[PDB]
């Protein structure tokens, strides 16, 4: 199949607040070429925590604009095709990548945008 890896990375009065971590990257995502599209019949959604998961900190990928949290795509779901991008995909949806200094304070860093095609032509893979 094809791996779809989403790397999240950041380096932390509130010292760890506002971590200037920008290495949010996608697998061979030539943005000018366009969103990274699924051309194989199978693909594996993968979330990578490059950011130092200090006990004080954590992260999330929960998306309100999308029907499915990242990692329910791995489950067999009705897609015909699907492209992933970190630039806004018109007529699609978006995933906020919040970051918690602690449970007390949150803030988003990046947004994961995903294309979408009709029906159930291609299914995901949770291998």
């Amino acid at each position, epitope marked *: 199949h094809t791996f779809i890896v989403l790397y999240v990375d950041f380096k932390p009065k509130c010292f760890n607040c506002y971590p200037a971590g920008v290495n949010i990257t996608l697998a061979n995502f030539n943005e000018t070429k366009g969103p990274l*599209c699924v*051309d194989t019949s199978h693909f594996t959604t993968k979330y990578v925590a490059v950011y130092a998961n200090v006990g004080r900190w954590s992260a999330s990928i929960n998306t309100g604009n999308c029907p499915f949290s990242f990692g329910k795509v791995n489950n067999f779901v009705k897609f015909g095709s699907v492209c992933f991008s970190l630039k806004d995909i018109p007529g699609g949806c978006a995933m906020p990548i919040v970051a918690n200094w602690a449970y007390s304070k949150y803030y988003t860093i990046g947004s994961l945008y995903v294309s*979408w095609s009709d029906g159930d032509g291609i299914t995901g893979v949770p291998q």
Partner: antibody, heavy 123, light 102 residues
């Protein structure tokens, strides 16, 4: 009322410069994608560049990438293609076209076509 | 970055015959157009799923594995056109050899 209108073609010297204007009515161009497609005389459809005018996304082709330039004026509701350094591989009839999006991000396809206008690279 | 292959590029059959135009790393994002010579094309099929409202029902397109296929049930005289299969998304456009169609 819904129309795509290609204009601004003609005859050009080798390595010259032209500007195609794709006006539109019945729909706002920013709410859709606008592509260009060139058909050479006695040939098939050759893929050219596209633009999402609202966000300004400019995608191109593998042949005309450092030679053609896509743009649009949404206040004018008109897309544009500036063509520079032309050769007889480019002489063809060019069509601007409207691509609409599915309820997801793939798009449905290229909805709407115009009648196009032909450019001729000749001395 | 994938390429598309279309064949045959000249298919001249008679009335009632079933023209079986076919093209072929892919997914559910292809389209089928017709075109009269020196005329504007028309959107016939998209995403190899359904028609465009108003398109005749004789045109039907679907895929199996890596093979997309348009078929016309009962050919009509006005169905004379050069049919083109397109692949890609709202940003990428790519075509094939074209198929020319007593």
């Amino acid at each position: 009322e819904v129309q795509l209108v290609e204009s601004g073609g003609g005859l050009v010297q080798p390595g010259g410069s032209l500007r195609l204007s794709c006006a539109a009515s019945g729909f706002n161009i920013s709410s859709s994608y606008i592509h260009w497609v060139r058909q050479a005389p006695g040939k098939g459809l050759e893929w050219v560049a596209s633009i999402y005018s609202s966000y300004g996304y400019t995608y191109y082709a593998d042949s005309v990438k450092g030679r053609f330039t896509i743009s649009a004026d949404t206040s004018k509701n008109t897309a544009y293609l500036q063509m520079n350094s032309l050769r007889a591989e480019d002489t063809a009839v060019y069509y601007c076209a409207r691509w609409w999006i599915t309820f997801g991000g793939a798009g449905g396809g290229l909805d709407y076509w115009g009648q196009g206008t032909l450019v001729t690279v000749s001395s | 970055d994938i390429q598309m292959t279309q064949s045959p590029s000249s298919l001249s059959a008679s009335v009632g015959d079933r023209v079986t135009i076919t093209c072929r790393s892919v997914s559910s994002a292809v389209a089928w157009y017709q075109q009269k010579p020196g005329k504007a094309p028309k959107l016939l099929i998209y995403s190899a799923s359904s028609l465009y409202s108003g398109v005749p029902s004789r045109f039907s397109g679907s895929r199996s594995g890596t093979d997309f296929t348009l078929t016309i049930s009962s050919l009509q005289p006005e169905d004379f056109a050069t049919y083109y299969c397109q692949q890609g998304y709202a940003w990428r456009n790519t075509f094939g050899q074209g198929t020319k169609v007593r």
